[PDB]
Coordinates of C-alpha atoms and ligand atoms in Angstrom, one line a residue:
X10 CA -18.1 -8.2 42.7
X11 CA -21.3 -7.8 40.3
X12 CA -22.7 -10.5 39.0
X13 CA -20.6 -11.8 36.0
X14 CA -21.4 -11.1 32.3
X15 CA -19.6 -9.9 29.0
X16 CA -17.5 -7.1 28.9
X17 CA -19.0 -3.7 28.2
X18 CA -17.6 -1.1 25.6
X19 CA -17.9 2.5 26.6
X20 CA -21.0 4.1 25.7
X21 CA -22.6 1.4 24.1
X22 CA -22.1 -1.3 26.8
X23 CA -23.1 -4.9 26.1
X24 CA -25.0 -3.8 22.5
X25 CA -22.6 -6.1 20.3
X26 CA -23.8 -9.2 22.8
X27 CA -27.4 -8.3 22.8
X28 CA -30.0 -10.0 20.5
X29 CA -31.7 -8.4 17.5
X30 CA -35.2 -10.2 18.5
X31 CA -35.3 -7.5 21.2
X32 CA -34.4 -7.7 25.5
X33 CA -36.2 -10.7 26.4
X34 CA -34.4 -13.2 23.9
X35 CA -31.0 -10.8 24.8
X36 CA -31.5 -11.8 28.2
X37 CA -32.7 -15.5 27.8
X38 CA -29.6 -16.0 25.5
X39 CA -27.2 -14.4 28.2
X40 CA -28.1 -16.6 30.6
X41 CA -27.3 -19.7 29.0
X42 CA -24.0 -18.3 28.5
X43 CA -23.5 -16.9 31.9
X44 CA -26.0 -18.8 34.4
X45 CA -29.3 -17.2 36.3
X46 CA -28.0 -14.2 38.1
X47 CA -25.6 -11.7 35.4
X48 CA -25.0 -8.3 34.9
X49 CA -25.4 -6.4 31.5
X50 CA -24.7 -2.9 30.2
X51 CA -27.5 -1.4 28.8
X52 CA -26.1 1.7 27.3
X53 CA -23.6 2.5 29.9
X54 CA -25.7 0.9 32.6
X55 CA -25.4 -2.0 34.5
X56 CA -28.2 -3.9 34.6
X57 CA -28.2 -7.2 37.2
X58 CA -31.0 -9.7 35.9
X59 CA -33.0 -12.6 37.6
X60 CA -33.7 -15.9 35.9
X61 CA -35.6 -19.0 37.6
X62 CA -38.0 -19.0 40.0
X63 CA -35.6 -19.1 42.7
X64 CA -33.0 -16.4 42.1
X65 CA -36.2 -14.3 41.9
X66 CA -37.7 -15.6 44.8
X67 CA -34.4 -15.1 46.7
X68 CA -34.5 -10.9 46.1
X69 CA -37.4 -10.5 45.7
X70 CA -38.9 -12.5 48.9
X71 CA -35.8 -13.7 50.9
X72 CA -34.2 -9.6 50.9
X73 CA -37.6 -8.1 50.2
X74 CA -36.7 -4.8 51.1
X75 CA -33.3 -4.6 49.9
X76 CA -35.0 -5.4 46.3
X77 CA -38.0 -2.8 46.9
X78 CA -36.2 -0.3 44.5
X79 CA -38.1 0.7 41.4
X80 CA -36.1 2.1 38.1
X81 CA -37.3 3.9 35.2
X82 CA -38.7 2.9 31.9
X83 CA -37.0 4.7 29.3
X84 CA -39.8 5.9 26.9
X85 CA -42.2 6.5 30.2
X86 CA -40.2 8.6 32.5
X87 CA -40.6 11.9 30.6
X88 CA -44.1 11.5 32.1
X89 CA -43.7 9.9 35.5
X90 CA -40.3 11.5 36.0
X91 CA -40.1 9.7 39.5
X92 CA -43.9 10.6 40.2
X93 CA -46.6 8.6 41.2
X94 CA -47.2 4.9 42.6
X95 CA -45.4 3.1 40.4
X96 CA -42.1 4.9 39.7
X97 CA -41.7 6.7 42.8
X98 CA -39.1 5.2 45.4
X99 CA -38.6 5.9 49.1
X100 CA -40.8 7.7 51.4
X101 CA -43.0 9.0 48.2
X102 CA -44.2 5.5 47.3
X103 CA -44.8 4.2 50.8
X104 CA -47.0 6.8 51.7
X105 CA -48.8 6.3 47.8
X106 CA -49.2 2.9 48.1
X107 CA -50.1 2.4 51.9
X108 CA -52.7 5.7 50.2
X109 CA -53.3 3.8 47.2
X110 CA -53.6 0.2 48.7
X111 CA -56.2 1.7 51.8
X112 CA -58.5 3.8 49.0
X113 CA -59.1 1.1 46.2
X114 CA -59.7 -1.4 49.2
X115 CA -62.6 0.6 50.6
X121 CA -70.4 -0.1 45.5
X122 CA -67.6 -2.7 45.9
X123 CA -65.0 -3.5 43.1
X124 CA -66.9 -6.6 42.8
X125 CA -70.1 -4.8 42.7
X126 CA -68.7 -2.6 39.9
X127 CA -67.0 -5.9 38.1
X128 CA -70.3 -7.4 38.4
X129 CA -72.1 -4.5 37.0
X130 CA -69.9 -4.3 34.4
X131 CA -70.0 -7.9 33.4
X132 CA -73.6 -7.4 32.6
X133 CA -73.0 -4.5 30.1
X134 CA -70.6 -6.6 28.5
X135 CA -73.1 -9.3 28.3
X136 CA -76.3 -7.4 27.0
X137 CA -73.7 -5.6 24.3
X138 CA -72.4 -9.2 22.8
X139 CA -75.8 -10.6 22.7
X140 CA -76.8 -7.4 20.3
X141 CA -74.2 -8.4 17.7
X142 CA -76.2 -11.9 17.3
X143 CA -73.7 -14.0 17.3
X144 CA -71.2 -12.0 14.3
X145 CA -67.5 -11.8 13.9
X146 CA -66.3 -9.4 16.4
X147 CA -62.9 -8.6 17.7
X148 CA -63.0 -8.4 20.9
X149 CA -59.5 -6.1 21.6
X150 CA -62.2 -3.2 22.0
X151 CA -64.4 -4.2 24.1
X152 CA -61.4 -5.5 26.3
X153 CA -60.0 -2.3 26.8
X154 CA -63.7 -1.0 27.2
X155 CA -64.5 -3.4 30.2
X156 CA -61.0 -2.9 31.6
X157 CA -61.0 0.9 31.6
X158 CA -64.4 1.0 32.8
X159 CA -63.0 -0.5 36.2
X160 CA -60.6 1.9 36.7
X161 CA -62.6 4.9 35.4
X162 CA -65.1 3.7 38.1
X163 CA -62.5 3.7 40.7
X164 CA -61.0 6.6 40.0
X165 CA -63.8 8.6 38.5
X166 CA -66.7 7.1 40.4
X167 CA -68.2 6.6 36.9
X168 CA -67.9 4.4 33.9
X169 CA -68.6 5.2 29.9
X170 CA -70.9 3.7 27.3
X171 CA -69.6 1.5 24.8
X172 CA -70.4 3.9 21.8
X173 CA -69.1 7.0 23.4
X174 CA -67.3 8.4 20.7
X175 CA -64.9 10.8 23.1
X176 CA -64.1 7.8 25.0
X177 CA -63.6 5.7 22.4
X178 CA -61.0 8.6 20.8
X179 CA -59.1 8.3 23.9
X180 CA -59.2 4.6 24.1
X181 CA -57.7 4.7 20.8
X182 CA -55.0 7.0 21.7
X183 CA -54.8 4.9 25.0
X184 CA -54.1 1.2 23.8
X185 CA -52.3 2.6 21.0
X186 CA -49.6 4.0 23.3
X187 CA -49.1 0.5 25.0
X188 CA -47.6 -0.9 21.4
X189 CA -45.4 1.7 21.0
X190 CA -43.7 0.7 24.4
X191 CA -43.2 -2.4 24.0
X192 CA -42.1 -1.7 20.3
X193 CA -38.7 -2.6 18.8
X194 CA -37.7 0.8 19.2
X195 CA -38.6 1.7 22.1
X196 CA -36.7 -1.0 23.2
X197 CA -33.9 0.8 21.5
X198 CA -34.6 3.8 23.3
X199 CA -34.2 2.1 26.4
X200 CA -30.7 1.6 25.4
X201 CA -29.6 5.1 23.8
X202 CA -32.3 7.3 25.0
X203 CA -29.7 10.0 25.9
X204 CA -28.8 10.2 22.4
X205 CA -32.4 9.3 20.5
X206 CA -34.4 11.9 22.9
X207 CA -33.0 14.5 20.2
X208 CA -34.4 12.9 16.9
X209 CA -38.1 12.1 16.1
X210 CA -39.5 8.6 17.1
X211 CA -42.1 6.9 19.1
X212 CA -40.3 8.4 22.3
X213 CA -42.7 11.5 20.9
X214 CA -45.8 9.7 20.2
X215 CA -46.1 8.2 23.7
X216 CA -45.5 11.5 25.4
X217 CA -47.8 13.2 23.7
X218 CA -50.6 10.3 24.4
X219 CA -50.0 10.4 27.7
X220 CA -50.3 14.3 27.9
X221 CA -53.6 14.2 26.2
X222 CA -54.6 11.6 29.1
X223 CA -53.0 13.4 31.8
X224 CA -54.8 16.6 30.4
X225 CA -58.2 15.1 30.5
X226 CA -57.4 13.8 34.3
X227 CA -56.4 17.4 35.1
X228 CA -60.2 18.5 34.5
X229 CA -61.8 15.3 36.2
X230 CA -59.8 17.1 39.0
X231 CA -60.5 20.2 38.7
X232 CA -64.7 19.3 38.6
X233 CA -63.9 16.9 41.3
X234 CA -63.4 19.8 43.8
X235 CA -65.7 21.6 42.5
X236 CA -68.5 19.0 43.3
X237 CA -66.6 17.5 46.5
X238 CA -68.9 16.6 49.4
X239 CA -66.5 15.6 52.5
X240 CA -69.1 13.8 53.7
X241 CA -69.8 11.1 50.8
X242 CA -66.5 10.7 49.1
X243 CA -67.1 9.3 45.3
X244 CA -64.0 7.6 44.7
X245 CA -60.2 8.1 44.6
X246 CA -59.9 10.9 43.5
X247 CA -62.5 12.5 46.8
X248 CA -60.4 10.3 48.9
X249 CA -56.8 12.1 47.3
X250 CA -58.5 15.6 47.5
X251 CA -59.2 15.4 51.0
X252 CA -55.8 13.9 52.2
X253 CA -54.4 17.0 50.1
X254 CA -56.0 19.2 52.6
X255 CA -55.6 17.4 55.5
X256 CA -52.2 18.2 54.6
X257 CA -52.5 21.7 53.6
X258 CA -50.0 22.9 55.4
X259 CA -47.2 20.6 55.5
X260 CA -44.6 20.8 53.0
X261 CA -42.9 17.7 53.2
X262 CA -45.9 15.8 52.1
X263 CA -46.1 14.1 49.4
X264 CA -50.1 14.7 48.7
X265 CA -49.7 17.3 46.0
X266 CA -51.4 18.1 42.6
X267 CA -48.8 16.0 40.7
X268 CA -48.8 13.0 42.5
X269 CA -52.2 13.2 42.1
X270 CA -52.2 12.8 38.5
X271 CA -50.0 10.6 38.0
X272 CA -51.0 8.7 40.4
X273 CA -53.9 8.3 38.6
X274 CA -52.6 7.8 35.1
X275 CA -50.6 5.3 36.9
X276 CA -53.5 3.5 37.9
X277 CA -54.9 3.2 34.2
X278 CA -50.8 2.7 32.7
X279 CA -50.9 -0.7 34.6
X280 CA -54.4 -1.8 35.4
X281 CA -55.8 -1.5 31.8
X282 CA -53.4 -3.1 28.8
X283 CA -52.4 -6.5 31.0
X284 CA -55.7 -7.0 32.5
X285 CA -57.0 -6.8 28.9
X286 CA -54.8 -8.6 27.4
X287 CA -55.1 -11.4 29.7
X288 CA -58.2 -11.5 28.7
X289 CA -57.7 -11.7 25.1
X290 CA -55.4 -14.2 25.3
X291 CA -57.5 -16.4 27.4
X292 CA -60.4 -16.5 25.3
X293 CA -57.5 -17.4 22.2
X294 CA -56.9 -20.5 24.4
X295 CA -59.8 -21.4 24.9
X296 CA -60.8 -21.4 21.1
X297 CA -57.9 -23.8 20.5
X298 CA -58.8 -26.0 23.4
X299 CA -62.9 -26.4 23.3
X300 CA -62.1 -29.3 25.7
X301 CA -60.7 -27.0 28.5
X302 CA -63.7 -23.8 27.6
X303 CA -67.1 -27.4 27.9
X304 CA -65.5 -28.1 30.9
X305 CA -65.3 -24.8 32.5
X306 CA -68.4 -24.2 31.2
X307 CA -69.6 -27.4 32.9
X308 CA -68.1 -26.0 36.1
X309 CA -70.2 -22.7 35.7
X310 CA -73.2 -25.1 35.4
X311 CA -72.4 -27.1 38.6
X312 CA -71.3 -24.5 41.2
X313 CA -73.2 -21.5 39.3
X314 CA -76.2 -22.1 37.0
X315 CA -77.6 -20.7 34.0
X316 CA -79.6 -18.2 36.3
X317 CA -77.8 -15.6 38.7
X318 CA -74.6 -13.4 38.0
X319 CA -71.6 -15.1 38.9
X320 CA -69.7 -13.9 42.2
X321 CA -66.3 -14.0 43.5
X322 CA -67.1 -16.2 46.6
X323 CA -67.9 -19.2 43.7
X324 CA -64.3 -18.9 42.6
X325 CA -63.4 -21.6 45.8
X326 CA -65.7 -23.5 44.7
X327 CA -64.5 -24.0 41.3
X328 CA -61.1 -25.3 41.4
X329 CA -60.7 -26.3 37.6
X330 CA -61.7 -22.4 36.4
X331 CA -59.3 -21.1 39.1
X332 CA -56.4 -23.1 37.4
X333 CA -57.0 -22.5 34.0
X334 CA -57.1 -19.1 34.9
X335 CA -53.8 -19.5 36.7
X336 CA -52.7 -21.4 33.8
X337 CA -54.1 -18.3 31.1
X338 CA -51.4 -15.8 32.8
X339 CA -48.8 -18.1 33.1
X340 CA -48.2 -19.0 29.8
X341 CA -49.8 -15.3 29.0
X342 CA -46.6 -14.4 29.9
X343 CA -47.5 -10.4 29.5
X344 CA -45.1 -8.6 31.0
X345 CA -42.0 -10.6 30.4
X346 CA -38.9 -9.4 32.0
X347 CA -40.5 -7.3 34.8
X348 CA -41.1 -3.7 35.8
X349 CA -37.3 -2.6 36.7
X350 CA -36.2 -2.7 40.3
X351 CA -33.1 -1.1 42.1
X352 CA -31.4 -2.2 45.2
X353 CA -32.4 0.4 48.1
X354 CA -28.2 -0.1 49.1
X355 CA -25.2 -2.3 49.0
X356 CA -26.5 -5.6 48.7
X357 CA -25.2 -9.1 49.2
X358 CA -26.2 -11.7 46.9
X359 CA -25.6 -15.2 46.5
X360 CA -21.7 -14.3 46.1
X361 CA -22.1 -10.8 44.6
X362 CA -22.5 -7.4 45.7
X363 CA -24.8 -5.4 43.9
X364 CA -24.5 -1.4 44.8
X365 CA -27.0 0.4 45.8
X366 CA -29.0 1.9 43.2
X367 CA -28.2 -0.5 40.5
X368 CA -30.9 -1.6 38.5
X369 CA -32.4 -5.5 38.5
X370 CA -35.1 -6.7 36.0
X371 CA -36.8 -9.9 37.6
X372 CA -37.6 -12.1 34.6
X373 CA -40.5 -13.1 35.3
X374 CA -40.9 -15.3 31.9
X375 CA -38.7 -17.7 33.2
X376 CA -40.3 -18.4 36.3
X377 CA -44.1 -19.1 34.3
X378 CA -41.6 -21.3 32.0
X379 CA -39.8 -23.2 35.1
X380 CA -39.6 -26.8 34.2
X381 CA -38.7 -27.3 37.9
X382 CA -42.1 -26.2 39.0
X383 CA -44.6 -26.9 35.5
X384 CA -44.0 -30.1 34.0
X385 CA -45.0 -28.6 30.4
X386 CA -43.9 -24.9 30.3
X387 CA -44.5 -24.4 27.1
X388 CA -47.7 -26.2 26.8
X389 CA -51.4 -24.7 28.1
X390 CA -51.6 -27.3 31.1
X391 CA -54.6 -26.6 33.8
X392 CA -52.5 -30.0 35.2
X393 CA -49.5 -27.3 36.8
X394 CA -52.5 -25.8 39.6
X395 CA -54.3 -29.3 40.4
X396 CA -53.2 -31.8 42.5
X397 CA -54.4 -35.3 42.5
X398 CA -57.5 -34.3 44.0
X399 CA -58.7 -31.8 41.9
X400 CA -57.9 -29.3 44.3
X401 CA -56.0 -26.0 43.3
X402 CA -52.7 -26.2 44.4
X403 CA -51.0 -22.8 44.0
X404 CA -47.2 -23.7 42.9
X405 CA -43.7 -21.4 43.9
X406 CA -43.5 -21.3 39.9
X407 CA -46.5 -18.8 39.7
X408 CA -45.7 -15.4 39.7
X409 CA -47.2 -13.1 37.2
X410 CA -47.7 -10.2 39.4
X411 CA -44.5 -10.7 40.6
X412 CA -42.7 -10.7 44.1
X413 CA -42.6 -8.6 47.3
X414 CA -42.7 -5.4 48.1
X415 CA -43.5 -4.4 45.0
X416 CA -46.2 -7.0 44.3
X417 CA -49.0 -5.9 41.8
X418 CA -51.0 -2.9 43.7
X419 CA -53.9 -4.6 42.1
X420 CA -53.8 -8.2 42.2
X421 CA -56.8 -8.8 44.1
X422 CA -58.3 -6.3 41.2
X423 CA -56.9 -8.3 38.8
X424 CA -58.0 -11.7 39.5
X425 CA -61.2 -10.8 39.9
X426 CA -61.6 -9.6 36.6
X427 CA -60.0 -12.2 35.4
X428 CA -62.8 -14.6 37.1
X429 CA -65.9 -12.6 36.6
X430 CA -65.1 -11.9 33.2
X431 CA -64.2 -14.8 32.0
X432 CA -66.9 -16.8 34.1
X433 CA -69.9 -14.4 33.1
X434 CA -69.2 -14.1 29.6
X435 CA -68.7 -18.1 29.5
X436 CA -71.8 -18.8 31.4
X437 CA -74.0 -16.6 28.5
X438 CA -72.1 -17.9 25.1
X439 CA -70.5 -20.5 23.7
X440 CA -67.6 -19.3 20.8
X441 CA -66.4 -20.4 17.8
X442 CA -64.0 -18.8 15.1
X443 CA -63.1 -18.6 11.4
X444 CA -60.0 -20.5 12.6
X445 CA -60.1 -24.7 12.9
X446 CA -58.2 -25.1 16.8
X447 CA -55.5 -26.7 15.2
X448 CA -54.4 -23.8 12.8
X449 CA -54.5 -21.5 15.8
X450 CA -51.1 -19.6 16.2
X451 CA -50.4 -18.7 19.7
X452 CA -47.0 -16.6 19.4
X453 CA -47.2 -13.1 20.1
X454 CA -46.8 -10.7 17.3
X455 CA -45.2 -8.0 19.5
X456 CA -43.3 -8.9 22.5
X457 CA -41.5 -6.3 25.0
X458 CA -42.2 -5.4 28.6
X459 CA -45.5 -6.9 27.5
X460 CA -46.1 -9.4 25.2
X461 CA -49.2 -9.1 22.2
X462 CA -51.1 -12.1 21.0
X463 CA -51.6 -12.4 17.5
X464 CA -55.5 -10.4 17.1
X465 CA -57.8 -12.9 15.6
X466 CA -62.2 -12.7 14.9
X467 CA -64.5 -14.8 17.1
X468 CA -68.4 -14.9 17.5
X469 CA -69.9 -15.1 20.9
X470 CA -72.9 -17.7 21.0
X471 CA -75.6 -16.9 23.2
X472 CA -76.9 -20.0 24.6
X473 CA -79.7 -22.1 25.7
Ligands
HEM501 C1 -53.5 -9.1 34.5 C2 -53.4 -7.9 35.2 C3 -52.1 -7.4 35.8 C4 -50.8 -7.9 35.7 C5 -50.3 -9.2 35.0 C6 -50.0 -7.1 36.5 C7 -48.7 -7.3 36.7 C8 -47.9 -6.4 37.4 C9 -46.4 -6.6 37.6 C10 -45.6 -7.8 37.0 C11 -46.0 -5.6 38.3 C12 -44.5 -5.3 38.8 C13 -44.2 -5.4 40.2 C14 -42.7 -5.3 40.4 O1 -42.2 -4.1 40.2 O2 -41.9 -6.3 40.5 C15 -47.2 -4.7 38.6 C16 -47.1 -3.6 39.3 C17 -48.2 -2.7 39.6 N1 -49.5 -2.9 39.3 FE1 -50.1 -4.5 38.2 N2 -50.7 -6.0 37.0 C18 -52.0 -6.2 36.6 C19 -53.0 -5.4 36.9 C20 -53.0 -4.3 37.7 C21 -54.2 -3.5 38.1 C22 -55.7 -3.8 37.7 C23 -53.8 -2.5 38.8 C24 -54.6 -1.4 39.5 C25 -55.9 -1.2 39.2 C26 -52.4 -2.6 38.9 C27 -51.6 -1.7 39.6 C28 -50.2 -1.8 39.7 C29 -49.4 -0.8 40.3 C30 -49.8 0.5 40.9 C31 -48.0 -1.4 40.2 C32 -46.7 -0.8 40.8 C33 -46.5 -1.4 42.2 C34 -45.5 -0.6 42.9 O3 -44.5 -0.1 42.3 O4 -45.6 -0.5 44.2 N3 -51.9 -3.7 38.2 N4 -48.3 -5.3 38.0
CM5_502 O1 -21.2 -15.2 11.8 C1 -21.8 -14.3 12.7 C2 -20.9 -13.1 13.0 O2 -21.6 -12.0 13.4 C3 -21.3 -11.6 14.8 O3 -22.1 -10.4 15.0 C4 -22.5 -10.5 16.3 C5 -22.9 -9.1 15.6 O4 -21.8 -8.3 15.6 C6 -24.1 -8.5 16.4 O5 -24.5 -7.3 15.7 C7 -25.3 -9.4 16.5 O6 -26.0 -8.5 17.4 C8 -27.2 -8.1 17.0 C9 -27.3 -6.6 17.3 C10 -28.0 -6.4 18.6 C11 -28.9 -5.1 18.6 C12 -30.3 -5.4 19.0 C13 -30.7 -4.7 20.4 C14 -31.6 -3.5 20.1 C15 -32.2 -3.0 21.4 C16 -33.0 -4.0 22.2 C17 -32.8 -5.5 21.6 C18 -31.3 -5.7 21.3 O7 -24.9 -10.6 17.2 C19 -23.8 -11.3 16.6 C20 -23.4 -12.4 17.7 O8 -22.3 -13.2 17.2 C21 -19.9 -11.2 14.9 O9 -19.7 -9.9 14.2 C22 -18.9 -12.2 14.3 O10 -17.9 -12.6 15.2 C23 -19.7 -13.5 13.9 O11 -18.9 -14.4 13.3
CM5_503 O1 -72.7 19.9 27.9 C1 -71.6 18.9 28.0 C2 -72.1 17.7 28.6 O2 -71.2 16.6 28.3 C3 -70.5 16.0 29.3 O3 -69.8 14.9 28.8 C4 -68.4 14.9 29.2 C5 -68.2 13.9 30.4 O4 -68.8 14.4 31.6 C6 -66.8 13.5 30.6 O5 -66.7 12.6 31.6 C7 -66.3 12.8 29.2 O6 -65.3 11.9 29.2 C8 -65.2 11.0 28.1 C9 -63.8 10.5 28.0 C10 -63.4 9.4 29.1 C11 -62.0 9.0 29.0 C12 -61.4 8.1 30.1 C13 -60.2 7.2 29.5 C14 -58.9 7.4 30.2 C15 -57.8 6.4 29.7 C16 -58.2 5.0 29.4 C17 -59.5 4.9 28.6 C18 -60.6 5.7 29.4 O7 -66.2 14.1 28.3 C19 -67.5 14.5 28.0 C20 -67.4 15.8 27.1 O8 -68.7 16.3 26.8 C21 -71.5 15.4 30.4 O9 -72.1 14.3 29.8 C22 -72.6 16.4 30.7 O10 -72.6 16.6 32.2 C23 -72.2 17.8 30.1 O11 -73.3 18.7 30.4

């Protein structure tokens, strides 16, 4: 009754059909064999995956809640083991993300974003205009957000503890989405006995978990109920609202992996977005003059910009739309499970089997993008140069599970880009033309090639 596929052997399921470029391409190349809705045995699992905006659309949106499961990730789970916003299921994730959702909602993100913006802007114009790469201060703006959410505080650039933890950080993100990991997605049950990078990224995250644990613990010891700081306050005082009741879900360890969760998926995609972004617009200077242009119309050279211009500047809107589409950065999904028995166009999926929504192959839909794999602004304006959002578009996914921090996100994603624009022009070693836009490493998130630029100040 599952959806159809090749036939697993024991133990090693659908590995003699599976692709030695790694998941994404094993899944891609299934699908032209066996349509946009299949099942495959990863190890001795069965996997159902989504291809096409629509079948996507259809669990994701049309049975919403059927669809609302969350699975594991192979090489993570040691961690998270079920903890946490982003792995836990049932009633533990709808009370942390109603929790979650309420708190970061509630100085304003876009005060902070702001703030930010204009200590990445007074650090470029120090260099002078030199070859930089900019992956470090990338993950130094984007950690700053959530360390100012979370911590109610944010680090210098030079920090040297910080930056030893940023390195341990970001470095932890390539070994996920490394080969083998990807193998130990597979054969974990075996490989969890032998070294690899299964060890690695446990003990990275430890170290980080570690350091939350005494941000905790000087937390409460500085707490004011009154004026709650950020977060973590806000978590502290919900744990004792709910001293005594067992059943709840408020404890120590959701409290620190809740938080680690919060930096695990706000921090890599969000600055890798970024990266790539300022990539494409090196090998397009025609799109980067006329966003530019845009900043000069709706903004000016003078104050910061805010997220209220971002409706006012349809052109930047889509070519940041267009930046995450073909971005592509987490290419397969965050796995889901079906909360029970499900019925699906023709098939019935048990309850509790995994699904990996690809979401590559909605951002490459040449139903909804008339270029997929081109860099095309064109796929979010209509004929008036209006932003016109399109059914295609869905980088943060679907649903119930939708990105927690979308609206985070985005706004980013617009004050970055549009205050670092407004202060510098950019140029590169490397002529547009000879620009290489594959990513080096691809996994559950994809890695642009890293390249030098210089940051211009101007006028
Ligand atoms: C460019 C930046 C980002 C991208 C592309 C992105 C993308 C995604 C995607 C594809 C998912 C999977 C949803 C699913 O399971 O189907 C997700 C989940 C999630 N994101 Fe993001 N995300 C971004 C930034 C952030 C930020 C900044 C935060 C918080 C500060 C955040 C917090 C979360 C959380 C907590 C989940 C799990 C949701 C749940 O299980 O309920 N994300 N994100
Ligand atoms: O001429 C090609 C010959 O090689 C074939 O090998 C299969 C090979 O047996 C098979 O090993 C190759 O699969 C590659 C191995 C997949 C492992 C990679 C996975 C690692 C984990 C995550 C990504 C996927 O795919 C081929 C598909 O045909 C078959 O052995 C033959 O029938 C065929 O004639
Ligand atoms: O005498 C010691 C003085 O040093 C303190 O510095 C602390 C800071 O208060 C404490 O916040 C700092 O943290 C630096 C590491 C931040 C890492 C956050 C990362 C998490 C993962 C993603 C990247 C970001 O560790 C420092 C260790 O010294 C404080 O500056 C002073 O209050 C204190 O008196």
């Amino acid at each position: 009754k599952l959806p159809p596929g090749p036939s697993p052997l024991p133990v090693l399921g659908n590995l003699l059909q599976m692709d030695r470029k790694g998941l994404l391409r094993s899944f891609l190349r299934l699908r032209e064999k066996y349509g946009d809705v299949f099942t495959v045995y990863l190890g001795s699992r069965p996997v159902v995956v989504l291809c096409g905006t629509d079948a996507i659309r259809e669990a994701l949106v049309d049975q919403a809640e059927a669809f609302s499961g969350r699975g594991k990730i192979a090489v993570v789970d040691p961690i998270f083991q079920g903890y946490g916003v982003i792995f836990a299921n049932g009633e533990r994730w709808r009370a942390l993300r109603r929790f979650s959702l309420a708190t970061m909602r509630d100085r304003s993100v876009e005060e902070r974003i702001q703030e930010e913006a204009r200590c990445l802007v007074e650090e470029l114009r120090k260099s002078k205009g030199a070859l930089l790469d900019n992956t470090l201060l990338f993950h130094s703006i984007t950690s700053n957000i959530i360390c100012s959410i979370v911590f109610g505080k944010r680090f210098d650039y030079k920090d040297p503890v910080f930056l030893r933890l940023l390195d341990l950080w970001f470095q932890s993100f390539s070994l996920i989405s490394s080969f083998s990991s990807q193998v130990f997605e597979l054969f974990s049950g075996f490989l969890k006995y032998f070294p690899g990078t299964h060890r690695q990224i446990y003990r990275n995250l430890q170290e980080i978990n570690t350091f939350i644990g005494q941000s905790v613990e000087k937390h409460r010891a500085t707490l004011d109920p009154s004026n709650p700081r950020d977060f973590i306050d806000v978590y502290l005082l919900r744990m004792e609202k709910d001293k005594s009741d067992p059943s709840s879900e408020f404890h120590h360890q959701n409290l620190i992996l809740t938080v680690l969760s919060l930096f695990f998926a706000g921090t890599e995609t969000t600055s890798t977005t970024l990266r790539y972004g300022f990539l494409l617009m090196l090998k397009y200077p025609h799109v980067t003059e006329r966003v530019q242009k845009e900043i000069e119309q709706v903004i000016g050279s003078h104050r910061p910009p805010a997220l209220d211009d971002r409706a006012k500047m349809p052109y930047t809107d889509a070519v940041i739309h267009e930046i995450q589409r073909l971005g592509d950065l987490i290419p397969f999904g965050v796995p889901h499970t079906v909360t029970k028995d499900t019925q699906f166009r023709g098939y019935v999926i048990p309850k509790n089997t995994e699904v990996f929504p690809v979401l590559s192959s909605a951002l490459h839909d040449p139903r909804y993008f008339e270029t997929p794999n081109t860099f095309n602004p064109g796929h979010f304006l209509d004929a008036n140069g209006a932003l016109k959002r399109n059914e295609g578009f869905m980088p943060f996914s679907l649903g119930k599970r939708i990105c927690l921090g979308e609206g985070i996100a985005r706004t980013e994603l617009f004050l970055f880009f549009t205050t670092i624009l407004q202060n510098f022009s950019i140029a590169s070693p490397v002529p547009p033309e000879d620009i290489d836009l594959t990513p080096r490493e691809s996994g559950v998130g994809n890695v642009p090639p890293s390249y030098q630029i210089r940051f211009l100040a101007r006028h």
